Design an enzyme around this catalytic site. Structure first.
Site, PDB file in Angstrom:
ATOM      1  N   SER A  42       9.328   4.834  -6.288  1.00 56.63           N
ATOM      2  CA  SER A  42       9.914   5.996  -5.673  1.00 56.63           C
ATOM      3  C   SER A  42      10.722   6.770  -6.680  1.00 56.63           C
ATOM      4  O   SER A  42      10.352   7.869  -7.046  1.00 56.63           O
ATOM      5  CB  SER A  42      10.763   5.579  -4.480  1.00 56.63           C
ATOM      6  OG  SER A  42      10.194   4.462  -3.813  1.00 56.63           O
ATOM      7  N   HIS A 155       2.877   8.481   7.772  1.00 56.50           N
ATOM      8  CA  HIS A 155       1.826   9.234   7.099  1.00 56.50           C
ATOM      9  C   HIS A 155       1.627  10.641   7.655  1.00 56.50           C
ATOM     10  O   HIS A 155       1.734  11.628   6.925  1.00 56.50           O
ATOM     11  CB  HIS A 155       0.809   8.274   7.718  1.00 56.50           C
ATOM     12  CG  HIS A 155      -0.219   7.777   6.750  1.00 56.50           C
ATOM     13  ND1 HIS A 155       0.110   7.079   5.608  1.00 56.50           N
ATOM     14  CD2 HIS A 155      -1.569   7.877   6.753  1.00 56.50           C
ATOM     15  CE1 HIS A 155      -0.994   6.769   4.950  1.00 56.50           C
ATOM     16  NE2 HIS A 155      -2.026   7.243   5.624  1.00 56.50           N
ATOM     17  N   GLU A 164       1.908  -2.326   5.756  1.00 54.42           N
ATOM     18  CA  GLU A 164       0.568  -2.798   5.414  1.00 54.42           C
ATOM     19  C   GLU A 164       0.215  -4.154   5.992  1.00 54.42           C
ATOM     20  O   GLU A 164       1.054  -5.053   6.047  1.00 54.42           O
ATOM     21  CB  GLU A 164       0.385  -2.815   3.888  1.00 54.42           C
ATOM     22  CG  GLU A 164       0.476  -1.447   3.232  1.00 54.42           C
ATOM     23  CD  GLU A 164       1.168  -1.411   1.883  1.00 54.42           C
ATOM     24  OE1 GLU A 164       0.730  -2.143   0.965  1.00 54.42           O
ATOM     25  OE2 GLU A 164       2.120  -0.612   1.728  1.00 54.42           O
ATOM     26  N   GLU A 205      -5.123   4.757   0.297  1.00 54.55           N
ATOM     27  CA  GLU A 205      -5.664   3.513  -0.237  1.00 54.55           C
ATOM     28  C   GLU A 205      -7.002   3.153   0.401  1.00 54.55           C
ATOM     29  O   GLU A 205      -7.663   2.200  -0.015  1.00 54.55           O
ATOM     30  CB  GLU A 205      -4.715   2.348   0.051  1.00 54.55           C
ATOM     31  CG  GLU A 205      -3.390   2.430  -0.690  1.00 54.55           C
ATOM     32  CD  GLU A 205      -2.448   1.300  -0.325  1.00 54.55           C
ATOM     33  OE1 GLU A 205      -2.745   0.562   0.637  1.00 54.55           O
ATOM     34  OE2 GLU A 205      -1.409   1.148  -1.003  1.00 54.55           O
ATOM     35  N   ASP A 242       2.743  -6.640   4.162  1.00 54.62           N
ATOM     36  CA  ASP A 242       3.718  -5.817   3.448  1.00 54.62           C
ATOM     37  C   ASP A 242       4.436  -4.961   4.510  1.00 54.62           C
ATOM     38  O   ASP A 242       4.111  -3.774   4.654  1.00 54.62           O
ATOM     39  CB  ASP A 242       3.116  -4.959   2.302  1.00 54.62           C
ATOM     40  CG  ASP A 242       4.119  -4.115   1.485  1.00 54.62           C
ATOM     41  OD1 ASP A 242       5.348  -4.345   1.608  1.00 54.62           O
ATOM     42  OD2 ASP A 242       3.671  -3.242   0.710  1.00 54.62           O
ATOM     43  N   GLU A 279       5.426  -9.476   1.706  1.00 57.76           N
ATOM     44  CA  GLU A 279       5.938  -8.602   0.640  1.00 57.76           C
ATOM     45  C   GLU A 279       7.047  -7.709   1.173  1.00 57.76           C
ATOM     46  O   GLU A 279       6.860  -7.079   2.213  1.00 57.76           O
ATOM     47  CB  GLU A 279       4.795  -7.740   0.070  1.00 57.76           C
ATOM     48  CG  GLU A 279       5.185  -6.890  -1.125  1.00 57.76           C
ATOM     49  CD  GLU A 279       4.114  -5.905  -1.536  1.00 57.76           C
ATOM     50  OE1 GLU A 279       4.438  -4.705  -1.684  1.00 57.76           O
ATOM     51  OE2 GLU A 279       2.945  -6.328  -1.686  1.00 57.76           O
ATOM     52  N   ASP A 306       8.605  -6.430  -4.184  1.00 58.79           N
ATOM     53  CA  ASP A 306       8.056  -5.153  -4.641  1.00 58.79           C
ATOM     54  C   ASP A 306       9.230  -4.230  -4.964  1.00 58.79           C
ATOM     55  O   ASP A 306       9.691  -4.258  -6.103  1.00 58.79           O
ATOM     56  CB  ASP A 306       7.057  -4.531  -3.643  1.00 58.79           C
ATOM     57  CG  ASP A 306       6.475  -3.184  -4.073  1.00 58.79           C
ATOM     58  OD1 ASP A 306       6.616  -2.826  -5.270  1.00 58.79           O
ATOM     59  OD2 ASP A 306       5.842  -2.506  -3.220  1.00 58.79           O
ATOM     60  N   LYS A 331       3.689  -3.686 -11.161  1.00 59.35           N
ATOM     61  CA  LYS A 331       3.203  -2.313 -11.245  1.00 59.35           C
ATOM     62  C   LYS A 331       3.388  -1.870 -12.673  1.00 59.35           C
ATOM     63  O   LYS A 331       4.509  -1.699 -13.141  1.00 59.35           O
ATOM     64  CB  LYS A 331       3.915  -1.369 -10.257  1.00 59.35           C
ATOM     65  CG  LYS A 331       3.497  -1.562  -8.807  1.00 59.35           C
ATOM     66  CD  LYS A 331       4.544  -1.027  -7.831  1.00 59.35           C
ATOM     67  CE  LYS A 331       4.033  -0.933  -6.410  1.00 59.35           C
ATOM     68  NZ  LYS A 331       5.087  -0.472  -5.467  1.00 59.35           N
ATOM     69  N   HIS A 359      -1.958  -1.808  -7.742  1.00 57.78           N
ATOM     70  CA  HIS A 359      -2.305  -0.404  -7.941  1.00 57.78           C
ATOM     71  C   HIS A 359      -1.176   0.448  -7.314  1.00 57.78           C
ATOM     72  O   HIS A 359      -0.177  -0.089  -6.817  1.00 57.78           O
ATOM     73  CB  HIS A 359      -3.604  -0.091  -7.152  1.00 57.78           C
ATOM     74  CG  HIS A 359      -3.505  -0.295  -5.659  1.00 57.78           C
ATOM     75  ND1 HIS A 359      -2.880   0.636  -4.822  1.00 57.78           N
ATOM     76  CD2 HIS A 359      -3.934  -1.334  -4.900  1.00 57.78           C
ATOM     77  CE1 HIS A 359      -2.954   0.134  -3.599  1.00 57.78           C
ATOM     78  NE2 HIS A 359      -3.566  -1.055  -3.594  1.00 57.78           N
ATOM     79  N   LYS A 382      -3.727  -6.798  -5.742  1.00 55.80           N
ATOM     80  CA  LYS A 382      -3.463  -5.900  -4.618  1.00 55.80           C
ATOM     81  C   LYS A 382      -3.970  -4.515  -5.075  1.00 55.80           C
ATOM     82  O   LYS A 382      -3.246  -3.768  -5.755  1.00 55.80           O
ATOM     83  CB  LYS A 382      -1.970  -5.897  -4.243  1.00 55.80           C
ATOM     84  CG  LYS A 382      -1.672  -5.118  -2.969  1.00 55.80           C
ATOM     85  CD  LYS A 382      -0.269  -5.376  -2.460  1.00 55.80           C
ATOM     86  CE  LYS A 382       0.273  -4.190  -1.700  1.00 55.80           C
ATOM     87  NZ  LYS A 382       1.067  -4.617  -0.519  1.00 55.80           N
TER      88      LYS A 382
HETATM   89  O1  LIG Z   1       3.435  -1.029  -2.338  1.00 55.73           O
HETATM   90  C1  LIG Z   1       2.447  -0.732  -3.050  1.00 55.73           C
HETATM   91  O2  LIG Z   1       1.753  -1.606  -3.617  1.00 55.73           O
HETATM   92  C2  LIG Z   1       2.060   0.715  -3.232  1.00 55.73           C
HETATM   93  C3  LIG Z   1       0.902   1.057  -2.299  1.00 55.73           C
HETATM   94  O3  LIG Z   1      -0.190   1.571  -3.067  1.00 55.73           O
HETATM   95  O4  LIG Z   1       3.159   1.602  -2.974  1.00 55.73           O
HETATM   96  P1  LIG Z   1       3.554   2.879  -3.893  1.00 55.73           P
HETATM   97  O5  LIG Z   1       2.320   3.264  -4.674  1.00 55.73           O
HETATM   98  O6  LIG Z   1       3.970   3.934  -2.893  1.00 55.73           O
HETATM   99  O7  LIG Z   1       4.692   2.370  -4.746  1.00 55.73           O
HETATM  100 MG   LIG Z   2       5.071  -2.558  -1.176  1.00 51.31          MG
END
Ligand SMILES: O=C(O)[C@@H](CO)OP(=O)(O)O
Ligand SMILES: [Mg+2]
Ligand SMILES: O=C(O)[C@@H](CO)OP(=O)(O)O
Ligand SMILES: [Mg+2]
Lengths: 419, 424
Positions: A42, A155, A164, A205, A242, A279, A306, A331, A359, A382
């Site tokens: 974010s 959304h 999720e 997604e 999630d 998650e 996350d 990430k 992703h 993921k």
């Molecule tokens: O939580 C995640 O894995 C992603 C979903 O693709 O969230 P964001 O890309 O919004 O960080």
């Molecule tokens: Mg997440």
């Protein structure tokens, strides 16, 4: 020969139609590595930071021309002549050139693009596939995928507070078989959800976001879609969630509150339904709650940090000591470089945790995370629903990797889980 | 050195999550060409037939293992040692090895996979980009995209009849600018739609599919999205339509949300009036599959100021195209690589329409992939127009990204088609 000759960047589009950076690194050998950088949320926060333009006369300020300029000038002048085969040295040269702790000067997107493109250029110079060049001779473990099927929240038309809902084909003998299992159940979900008052459209997604009566109902739909497709829950197909509680306080199941009460809610679900992973089960900075959530079901459930850990070594080391979680979501763009991503994957791994390579919303045709997950024998990925090229491309790369390994390939299966 | 050493196929997944074939062609030089086939039938017919397994224990019968075996065994044995640089001869070898007029024995998907992968393997061998290897020294024209932004009819819960509404950035100075224009408009339409009570959906192209009340409403919402984005209709942005009237055709057509029917001649009059009200430059399948009488009349009334694209009407069939050229039935053809089954035959269909004054519109399929061949094919043949859908899913965006890379690589040689793409 593996020495950098030219570094070129351009502005391309991501899977949302938003601009993003693609970097091409050309070596003396004539080998080129190409990488597209993702983007999501974010921030600004305290993850690495991407350089956006803010020019309202182009892509509503979401342009990446400054990041392209930081590569074609600043990064290119500083790295031309650098040995691309030396990844650790290249990444600490990029971090040195930036000088900021969150990659705000050059951009996290400009740094990662070069970082990844240099690895690909070098891998092609050694005539090696990316997973092998990255992880060496022992890179062979194919991950159990976290396949998105149902969404929820913002959304958006309104669904259960949860975010999720994913499936995991643990029982499969190979990634190829596991992929078929989830794809079948994704299509079988529609043979239950469609003709009942819902659309077939997708999100960012590929997953769907319908309307539901109760928080227990999405699990009941998924569990039906499993046996209707001919699969046995637990033994073959297991659930991964999630809820992303940071955005929310169950509005409305009637029960809204409380850090200690929330942990007690999750214990009930796991006792009746096959949930293996949860998650962001608690907020971004609710460190007290995480520790309790761990002590309660951590020996029977996987707890993924996350937004709680945001791919940060400092707070990962903090959650290791505090025993706050047992899994981190990795990430690539949240940290900003390959070396630092590999560093965070190893730290979690060597602390008995699992690294879940992920992703983001703004994806691309780039499949690095498919090679990064095999290189590190991470055991889990993921990368979204089996329904959009931005996600399917990654699954296809995993098919190519599995075939290329031949008899060496091993699917993680139940061995991916530290119970 | 450009002699084929190995041909290997695998079953991958398409953008819908359905199995598809990927073919790798390895030459003596060590160069590898890789190609994914887009989908894809198996709307008989008069097109090339793809090979699906029919094994209901795997992907509900949609498996592609039979086509993979026809490549790994039959095609590999026949083509190992063949020169990959000889495209025409290779395609003649694949066509002859099959023996059927619709590629039903080996599969159109197995033939296209090898045909395409061999061209890529060869381009890499000459160290050339695909568009350059395919169309030579004069391959430089970047197409005006037909960008899907609104969906209807089938993918319509109940509101709307037609099928797809597209925008074309004709007035842009480059493909880079035109793509941004369309991206900005698509996003502005996402704002316009939410500021009406709908949501931001996206069927397989990326386009929004809301439940609308009138046949004019999708065109009106588009005009507002073009204007609010800061663009001028006609001069900068034009509308391209694919009503796919085969879907609503005893008969004379049936308009469910308009409560009308009429004659093919009246259905022509409907298009004549709408074209006078909105900046519509192109209309695809304005009349049904076999309404050859209607099509000939539609040309007489609009063919001097509107592009009339045959899709289901021509089905990338050279016999049907030669018929329509003579019969004066249309003035443009939608080119689907996998409907004809080979690269040489696709090039033949594009050339037959081009010479004879028609436009060849290169199109993607519903189930696409990471494969970006059509971006190189549109430039190689200077087609001037592409139909790759909304600027949203990576199946679509990958093709836009390839066109950005082609335009950059060409440098001063690159020329965006603009209004020159049309015969208006
Ligand atoms: O939580 C995640 O894995 C992603 C979903 O693709 O969230 P964001 O890309 O919004 O960080
Ligand atoms: Mg997440
Ligand atoms: O015409 C098209 O562009 C697509 C999208 O509907 O259809 P098909 O599956 O026939 O390629
Ligand atoms: Mg059509």
């Amino acid at each position: 020969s593996t020495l950098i000759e030219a570094i070129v960047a351009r502005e391309v589009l991501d899977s949302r139609g938003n601009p993003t950076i693609e970097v091409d690194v050309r070596l003396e050998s004539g080998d080129v590595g190409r990488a597209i950088v993702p983007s999501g949320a974010s921030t600004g926060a305290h993850e690495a930071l991407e350089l956006r333009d803010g020019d309202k006369s182009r892509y509503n300020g979401k342009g990446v021309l400054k990041a392209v300029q930081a590569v074609n000038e600043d990064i290119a002048e500083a790295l031309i002549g650098f040995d691309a085969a030396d990844q650790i040295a290249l990444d600490q040269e990029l971090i040195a050139l930036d000088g900021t702790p969150n990659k705000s000067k050059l951009g996290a997107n400009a740094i990662l693009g070069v970082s990844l493109a240099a690895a690909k250029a070098a891998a092609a110079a050694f005539g090696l596939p990316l997973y092998r060049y990255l992880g060496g001779v022992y890179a062979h473990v194919l991950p159990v995928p976290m396949m998105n099927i149902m969404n929820g929240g913002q959304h958006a038309t309104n669904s259960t507070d949860f975010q999720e809902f994913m499936i995991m084909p643990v029982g499969a003998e190979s990634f190829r078989e596991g992929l078929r299992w989830g794809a079948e159940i994704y299509h079988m979900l529609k043979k239950v959800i469609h003709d009942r008052g819902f659309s077939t459209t997708v999100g960012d997604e590929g997953g769907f976001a319908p309307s539901l009566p109760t928080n227990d109902a999405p699990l009941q739909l998924i569990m039906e879609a499993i046996e209707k497709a001919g699969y046995r829950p637990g033994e073959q197909i297991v659930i991964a969630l999630d809820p992303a509680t940071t955005e929310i306080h169950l509005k409305r199941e009637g029960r809204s509150l409380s850090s200690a009460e929330m942990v007690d809610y999750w214990v009930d679900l796991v006792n009746r339904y096959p949930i293996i992973s949860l998650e962001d089960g608690l907020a971004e900075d609710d460190w007290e709650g995480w520790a309790l959530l761990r002590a309660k079901l951590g020996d029977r459930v996987q707890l993924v940090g996350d937004d709680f850990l945001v791919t940060n070594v400092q707070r990962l080391q903090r959650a290791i000591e505090a025993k706050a979680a047992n899994s981190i979501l990795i990430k690539l763009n949240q940290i900003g470089s390959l070396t630092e991503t590999l560093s965070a994957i190893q730290l979690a791994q060597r602390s008995g945790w699992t690294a879940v390579v992920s992703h983001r919303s703004g994806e691309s045709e780039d499949v690095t995370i498919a090679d990064l997950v095999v290189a590190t024998n991470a055991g889990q990925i993921k990368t979204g629903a089996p329904a959009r090229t931005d996600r399917i491309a990654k699954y296809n790369q995993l098919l190519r990797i599995e075939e290329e390994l031949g008899s060496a390939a091993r699917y993680a299966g139940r061995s991916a889980f530290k119970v």
